[PDB]
Amino acid sequence: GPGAYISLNYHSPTIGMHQNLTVILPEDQSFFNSDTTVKPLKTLMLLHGLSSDETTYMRYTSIERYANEHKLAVIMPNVDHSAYANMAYGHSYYDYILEVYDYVHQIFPLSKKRDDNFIAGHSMGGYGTIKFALTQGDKFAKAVPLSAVFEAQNLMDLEWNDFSKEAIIGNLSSVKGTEHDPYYLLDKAVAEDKQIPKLLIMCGKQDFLYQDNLDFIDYLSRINVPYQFEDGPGDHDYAYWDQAIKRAITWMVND
Amino acid sequence: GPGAYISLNYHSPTIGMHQNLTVILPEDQSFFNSDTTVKPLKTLMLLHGLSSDETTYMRYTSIERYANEHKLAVIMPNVDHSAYANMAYGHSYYDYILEVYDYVHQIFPLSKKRDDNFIAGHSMGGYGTIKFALTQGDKFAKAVPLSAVFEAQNLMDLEWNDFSKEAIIGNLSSVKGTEHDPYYLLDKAVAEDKQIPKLLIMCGKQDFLYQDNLDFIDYLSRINVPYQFEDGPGDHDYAYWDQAIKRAITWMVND
Amino acid sequence: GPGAYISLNYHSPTIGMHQNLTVILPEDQSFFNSDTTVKPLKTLMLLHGLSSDETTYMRYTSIERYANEHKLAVIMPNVDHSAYANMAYGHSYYDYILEVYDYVHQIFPLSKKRDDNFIAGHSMGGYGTIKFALTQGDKFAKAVPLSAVFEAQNLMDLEWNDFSKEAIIGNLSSVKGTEHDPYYLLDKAVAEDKQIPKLLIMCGKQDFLYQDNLDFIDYLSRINVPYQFEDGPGDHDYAYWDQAIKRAITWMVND
Amino acid sequence: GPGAYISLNYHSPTIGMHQNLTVILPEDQSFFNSDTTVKPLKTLMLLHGLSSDETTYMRYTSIERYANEHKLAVIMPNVDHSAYANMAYGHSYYDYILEVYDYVHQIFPLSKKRDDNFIAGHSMGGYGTIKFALTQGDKFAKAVPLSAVFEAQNLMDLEWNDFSKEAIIGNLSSVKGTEHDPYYLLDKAVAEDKQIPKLLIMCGKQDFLYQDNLDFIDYLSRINVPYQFEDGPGDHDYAYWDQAIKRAITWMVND
Ligand SMILES: *C(=O)N1CCCC[C@@H]1c1ccccc1
Ligand SMILES: *C(=O)N1CCCC[C@@H]1c1ccccc1
Ligand SMILES: *C(=O)N1CCCC[C@@H]1c1ccccc1
Ligand SMILES: *C(=O)N1CCCC[C@@H]1c1ccccc1
C-alpha cells in the first residue's frame, strides 16, 4: 500500500528562517477513521550528505517505496554544509535536528518510544548519524551510518565546492578530542555509561572512505561495543546508497 | 506569527489515485515542546472554484498570512471539474472531501470539535460549501460560500472550457429535487431538523452570480433560516476572493 | 551529472484547469554560460499508470539518476483515470499530452527533432504510449510500452477503485475497431504508411498482462512491423518499472 | 490572466549544493503554438529578506496574480542568512545570484535585453537589490529596494535569531568603505561612470528603516543620481510588501 509524500516549509525558531523538510508517511487504516486513535508509526531520521538536501533521497533513490513496504515514516531535513554542527559562524544545525525531531513527533502520528525511532545517513550524514547516536542515544534505538566519515579531520580539510571548514569549527587547530570527533564522543559515551544505539555500518568496498570505516569498527571492537558491518561492491554514490538504504530499512524495522 | 506550508500527495482509497493536497498549519508553542500536549487548532476546509486546484489559493491570495494571524489551519484539496459530487461518470469526490477531513484530523493536530471546524470556498467551491453545510452540518459550525452558485442548473449548463455536465450528473435533464440542488438540500435539512452551520454568504456587487446570491438569501429569509450576507464592490476574481477570505477568516475564529 | 527537478503548475487551455506536471532537466554546461547557445536536450514523454500521477515516477523509482546519467530530459504529466483519451464525459486528455509536448518544447531547451524525442509509460501509460506512437508517429523516433495493455477491452472492463469506463468511452459496447483499440490504430498506421517509432516493449513474466503482451508482439510479427521485446522475471509493480525504465533510457539515447 | 508556478531544485556549481528556486512564468500564446517564435518575457529578480526563503513571496503576497497581469516573469532564489554576499565563512551567494540570472535566462523564454530585466527585494533583499544595482548595472534597467537597509552596519549588528555577522564579513569590525557598504558602492559607481538602473525606492513611514531610507535618498540627491521615492503608511511586514510589490511591478513594466 502507498502512503503520503509530504513537503513542509516552516519558520524554524532554532535556525531563524524558513526551511524545507520532507516527510514520508506510510498509510495506516487508522488514518482514515475519525473515531479511532492514530496508530503511531516507527520513525527514521534520515540525514543527507554534503551537497545533497531534503529532496535528494527522494530523487536519487526509491526510499519511499522501501519505507512503504515496512510502515516506516522517514524524516529528511536540510542542513546545508553544516556537518550537523552548531556552527561557529552559521546556524545551530545540531539543535535544528533536535527541533525537527520534536516538531514532527508533535504534529504527525509518530511513535515517541526509543525502540521505534532510528537515525541514518550517508557521508556527512553518516558522520551526523554517528554524532547523534553518541550524544542522543536515549532518542534512537538504532543508527545506520552509510559511507560515513569517522575521522573528521579528513572532512574539515576536504576542499569541497564552496565548503567552509571555519564556518563549522571556527579557528580550531584540530578536531581531535572535541565534540566534532566521533572517537572522542564514543569514548565519552562509554565513560558516561550512555546507551549506544544498535549499530549497522555500511560502506562500499570501493569507497575512498572504506579504510576510514575499517579503522572505526576496529576501534569499536577494541572497546567491546557491538556492531554489524556490511561491505560489498559499491562506491560513493547514490547507486550504492539506494541499495544500502533498502537493506538498512529492513534491518531497522525487523528486530 | 508564522507557520508551516505543507504540500501532501497520498494515494486516496476513495478516489483510487494519488492526489495532491495543501495544508496551512500555523505555529503553536506546543508543536516545539516534546513534554507538552499538542493543542489542537481550529480548522477550515477551503474549496476551490472551477479551473482552480489545491495550489491556487496560496498563489493568488495572501491566505497563509491571514490564517497565521488567527492560528487557523486551512485544508485545500483538489476536486478537478467535479462540482464536489460523487460523479455519475468520474470520481467519488463528495466522499473524497469527507476522507480528506478525516485524514488531516488524524495526522495533524487539528481539533475535532464541531465549534472548531469551518468550511468555505468560491464559485464551484461556494456551491460545494453549501452542499456540505446542508448535508454534513454535524461536522462544521460555520460555512462561508463566496461568489457561490446556488441554482445548480446554471453550473451544469455552463459552457466552460472542457467542462462536462454529464460527468457529474449523468442523464439528468434537471438537477431540481436531487442531491445536486442546494434548494432541495436546504428544504431537506430544515425538514429533518438538522444543524445548519452559521452562514456568512459573500458576493461582489459586480459578480455575474450576484442575482443568484440575492435569490438564495431571499429564500433563506422566506423560510426563516438565519444568515449574514456581505456584499460591496467586487467581481468574480481572486482580487475579490483575497479580500473576502481575509474577512471570512476573522469572522470564523471570533465568537 | 546532476540536474534540475522541476514541478510546474499551469492553467491548461486544453483541459480548462490548473494541473501539475513534473520535469527532469539534466544539467548542461551551456545552461550556465550566457556566451554559449543552449544545446537542446533529448526528451522523453513518460506516462503514468492507473492510480499514479505526475509525482510517482520520482517517488518510486530512481529515474532522475538514470536520466541525468544520459542527459535525457523527462516530462511527466498527470492524466488521472483518463487512459490518455479525449474522454466522452471528462477531459480532453489526448489533446492534453500534445499540448504538454508543445508547451515544454517552447519554454525549455528541448530538442524538437523527431530523432531526439521519445515516449514511454507503464500499464495505462503503456497503452497511452502505443496510442501516441501509432497516431503521432512523426513526433517520436522511439516508443517504449512497459507492462502495457494492448487489448483495450481489458482496461475498460477493469473494476479498479473508483474507475469509470463510461467516462472514457461513453456508451460504447466494445472498443474493438475504434480509436481506443491499439490493433485498429496499428492496422490504420500500416495502411496509411505512417512512420512507426522504434518499439521496445517490456513486460515481466509474472505480470498478468504478459500474455496480452505476447499476443500483441505476435500480431506485430505477423504484419511485418519490427520491434524489440524484453521480458524476464518481474511483476506488475514499481520494483519492475524502476529496473525497466533504467534499461529503456539506455536503449533510447544510444543507437 | 494565468501562468505557471514553478519550483526548481538544481545542484548549483557556484554554491556546491542542491538549492530550491521559485519561478513565476506568465502564459503567452507563443508558448502553446509549436509554429510560432517564443516572445521572451520581461523578467524580475526578486530577493527575500532575512529569515524568508524562495517560497515566502508566493505565500505571504499575491505576487503571482500581479505578475500575471503584467506578463512579468519573476525569479525568487534562496540565499539564507547571507545578505547576498560572497561570505567570508559560508557560501558564494553574490556569485550565486549571477548564476541564477544566467541559468534561468538560458533555460526559460526570458528576455536578455537590459531594458527587459529588473531587480527588487525587501529588507535584506532591498540591500541585495542596491548592491547588485550598483555592481551589475548592465544587467538591470530598473531596481526597486523595498524597506531596504542602506547603512549596512545595522543589519550586521542586528542580533536576529541565529544570524551570524562573522559568517558574512569575517573578522571585520566595520563594513564602512567595503563591498558590503552601499554608500561606498554608490560612490564607486559614480566615480567609474557606470550605468545605474532606474531606482524606485519604497518604504513605509512606520518602518524602523524609514530614517535610514531618507538618509540614502538625500545622498542620491546630493550626487545627482535620479530616483523615485514612495512612502506612505506601512510597517516592516508582508502586508506592506504585498501592496508595494504590486505597485513596483506596474512601475517596472511601464516605460
Ligand atoms: C562525505 O560527505 N564525502 C562526500 C564526498 C566524498 C568524500 C567526502 C569526504 C571525504 C573525505 C573525508 C570526509 C568527507
Ligand atoms: C464558478 O466556479 N464557475 C466556474 C467559472 C466562472 C463562474 C462559474 C459559474 C458561473 C455561472 C453559474 C455557475 C458557475
Ligand atoms: C494499468 O495501469 N492498469 C491499472 C492497474 C493494474 C494493471 C491495470 C490493467 C490490468 C488489466 C487490464 C487492463 C489494465
Ligand atoms: C531585514 O531583512 N532585516 C531582517 C529582520 C527584520 C528587519 C531587519 C533589519 C532591520 C533594521 C536594520 C537592519 C536589518
HSE of A201, CA atoms in CB hemisphere, 13 A: 25
Buried b / exposed e over D195-233, threshold 16 CB at 10 Å, is ebbbbbbbbbeebebbebbeebbeebeeeeeeeeebbee
Contact (Cβ atoms closer than 8 angstroms) between residue C133 and residue C140:
yes
CA-wise closest residue to A223 among A184, A251, A177, A252 = A184
Which ligand is the nearest neighbour of the Cα of B158?
A: 2
Give the whole-angstrom CA distance, residue D123 versus residue B206.
Answer: 38
Pocket of ligand 3 (CB under 6 A): C 49-50, 123-124, 149, 154-155, 158, 160, 209, 236
Among B25, B32, B50, B60, the residue to mutate for chain D (most D Cβ within 10 A):
B60
Ligand nearest to the CA of C49: 3
Q: How is residue C29 written as a grid cell?
A: 554546461
Rounded CA Rg of chain D: 18
At A9, phi and psi to the nearest 5?
-130, 115
Q: Do A62 and C5 touch (CB under 8 A)?
A: no
3-state secondary structure (DSSP) of residue D206 = coil
Residue among D116, D181, D207, D212 flagged as catalytic = D207
Instruction: Round to whole Å and give the CA distance between B54 and B10.
Output: 13
Grid coordinates representing D233 are: 503608511
Among A51, A53, A56, A158, say which to mutate for ligand 1: greatest number of ligand atoms within 8 Å of CB. Answer: A158
Write the DSSP symbol of residue D92: B
CB contact under 8 A, D55 and B239: no
B155 CA from centroid of ligand 2 (Å): 6
CB neighbours (10 Å) of residue C66?
21
Query: For residues D97 and D44, what is the distance between their CA atoms, to the nearest angstrom?
Result: 12
- CB B213, CB B148: distance < 8 Å: yes
C50 and B17 within 8 Å at the Cβ level: the answer is yes
Helix (H), strand (E) at residue D44: strand D42-47
Dihedral angle sign, alpha carbons of residues C123, C128, C129, C135 = positive
Q: Report whether D59 contacts D109 (CB < 8 A).
A: no
Question: Around Cβ C218, how many Cβ atoms within 10 Å?
Answer: 9
CA distance B44 to B32: 23
Q: Which ligand is nearest to the CA of C147?
A: 3
Pocket probe mutation, ligand 3, options C158, C235, C237, max atoms within 8 Å of Cβ = C158
CB contact under 8 A, D18 and A50: no
The angle at the Cα of D239, spanning D233 to D245, to the nearest 5 degrees, equals 85
- C167: nearest CB among B19, B92, B167: B167
List residues in chain D touching A: CB distance below 8 A. 9, 11, 13-20, 50-53, 55-56, 80-81, 87-92, 160-164, 166-167
DSSP alpha helices (H): ranges in B108-209? 124-135, 152-156, 165-169, 182-191
By the 10 Å C-beta count (0-12 exposed, 13-18 middle, 19+ buried), C98 is classed as middle
Reduced to 3 states (helix: H, G, I; strand: E, B; else coil), residue C17 is strand
Q: What are phi and psi of A184, to 5 degrees?
A: -65, -45
CB contacts, 8 Å: C18 with chain B: 51-53, 55-56
Q: For residue A134, give the nearest of A185, A83, A179, A187 by alpha carbon.
A: A185
Under an 8 A CB cutoff, do D238 and B62 touch? Answer: yes
Last residue before each break in chain D (C–N > 2.5 Å): none
DSSP letter at C42? E
Residues 6+ apart with CB under 8 A from D146: D120, D121, D122, D123, D125, D126, D202, D203, D241, D244, D245, D248
This PDB structure is determined at a resolution in Å of: 1.9
Between the CA of B152 and the centroid of ligand 2 the distance, in Å, is: 10
- For B71-220, where are the E strands, in sequence order? 72-76, 117-122, 142-146, 198-202
- Helix (H), strand (E) at residue A67: helix A63-69
- Contact between D110 and C38 under an 8 Å Cβ cutoff? The reply is no
Distances (CA, A) of D245 to B213, D50, D123: 34, 17, 13
- What the block records as the C-alpha cell of A200 is 549497522
Residue D92 designated active-site: no
Helices and strands of chain C, counted as H and E runs: 9, 8
What nine digits make up the cell of D97? 545570484
d(CA D177, CA D233): 33
Q: Which of B43, B60, B62 is CA-nearest to residue B104?
A: B43
Cα–Cα distance between C11 and B59 in angstroms, integer?
Answer: 12
Which set of grid coordinates corresponds to residue A58? 527522494
Residue D81 carries which DSSP code?
Answer: T
**Are C146 and C197 a contacting pair, CB within 8 Å?**
no
Please state, in angstroms and rounded to a whole number, the distance separating the CA atoms of residues C207 and C227: 20
A233 and A205 Cβ atoms separated by less than 8 Å = yes
With beta carbons less than 8 A apart as the criterion, state whether D43 and C51 touch: no
CA D62 from chain center: how many Å? 17
Residue among B252, B202, B201, B200 at smallest CA distance from B72: B252
- Contact between C79 and C97 under an 8 Å Cβ cutoff? The reply is yes
> Cβ contact (<8 Å) for B61 and D62?
yes
The DSSP output letter for C250 is H
Residues of B in contact with D59 (CB under 8 A): 5, 58, 64-65
C28 and C52 in contact (C-beta within 8 Å)?
Answer: no
Can you tell me the distance from the alpha carbon of B21 to that of B104, in angstroms, rounded to the nearest whole number? Answer: 10
Which residue, chain included where needed, has cell 497503452? C127
Integer angstrom CA distances of residue A117 from A40, A43, D53, D98, D205: 11, 5, 30, 43, 51
> In whole angstroms, what is the distance from residue B16 CA to residue B103 CA?
15
**Residue D4: which residues within 8 A CB-CB, separation 6 or more?**
C8, C9, C10, C107, D23, D24, D25, D26, D27
Nearest to B20 among C20, C50, C163 (CB): C20
Interval between CA C174 and ligand 4 midpoint (Å):
68
Separation CA C165–CA C153 (nearest Å): 10
> Which H or E run contains B20?
strand B17-26
b/e code B184-200 from CB counts within 10 Å (16+ = b): bbbeebeeeeeebbbbb
**Phi/psi of residue B69, nearest 5 degrees:** -60, -30
Q: Determine contact, residues C106/D108, Cβ cutoff 8 Å.
A: no
Rounded CA Rg of chain B: 18
Secondary structure letter of residue A73 according to DSSP: E
Angstrom distance (rounded) from CA A117 to CA A139? 7
Most D CBs within 10 A among B25, B57, B58, B59, hence the mutation to make, goes to B59
Q: How far apart are CA B12 and CA C18, in angstroms?
A: 20
Among left, alpha and beta (phi > 0; psi -120 to 50; other), residue B175 is alpha
Distance (Å) of CA D36 to CA B188, C104, C155: 56, 14, 38
Question: In degrees to the nearest 10, what's the CA dihedral of C103, C106, C112, C114?
Answer: 10
CA Rg, chain A, in Å? 18
Closest C-alpha to D186, from D171, D202, D200, D197: D197
- Candidates C160, C79, C89; CA nearest to B168 is C89
Strands, E assignment, chain C: 3-12, 17-26, 42-47, 72-76, 117-122, 142-146, 198-204, 228-232
Q: Distance between CA atoms of D4 and C17, rounded to whole angstroms?
A: 12
d(CA D31, CA C108): 10
CA–CA gap between residue A134 and residue A227 (Å, rounded) = 14
Beta strands in B32-147 (DSSP E): 42-47, 72-76, 117-122, 142-146
- CB contact under 8 Å between B108 and A108, yes or no, is yes
Pocket, ligand 1, Cβ cutoff 6 A: A 49-50, 123-124, 149, 154-155, 158, 236
Residue C22 bridge partners (DSSP) = C7, C76
Kindly report the number of other CB atoms within 10 A of residue C169's CB atom: 22
A122 beta partners:
A146
Buried b / exposed e along A213-234 (16+ C-beta atoms within 10 A): beebbeebeeeeeeeebebeeb
CB-closest option in C55, C65, C242 to A5: C55
3-class state of residue C212 by DSSP:
helix
Is residue D158 in contact with ligand 4, taking CB distance under 6 Å?
yes
- Within 13 Å of residue C58, how many CA atoms lie on the same side as its CB? 23
Catalytic, out of D116, D123, D180, D212: D123
Q: Is C167 helix (H, G, I), strand (E, B) or coil?
A: helix
How many other CB atoms sit within 10 Å of the CB of residue D164? 22
The enclosing H or E element of A200 equals strand A198-202
Angle at the Cα of A104 from the Cα atoms of D124 and C62, rounded to 5 degrees: 85
Ligand 4 neighbour D83 (Cβ under 6 A) = no
What residues contact D159, with CB distance under 8 A and at least 6 apart? none
Contact partners, residue A193, CB within 8 Å, separation at least 6: none
D188: number of Cβ within 10 Å: 14
φ, ψ (nearest 5 deg) of residue A141: -85, -20
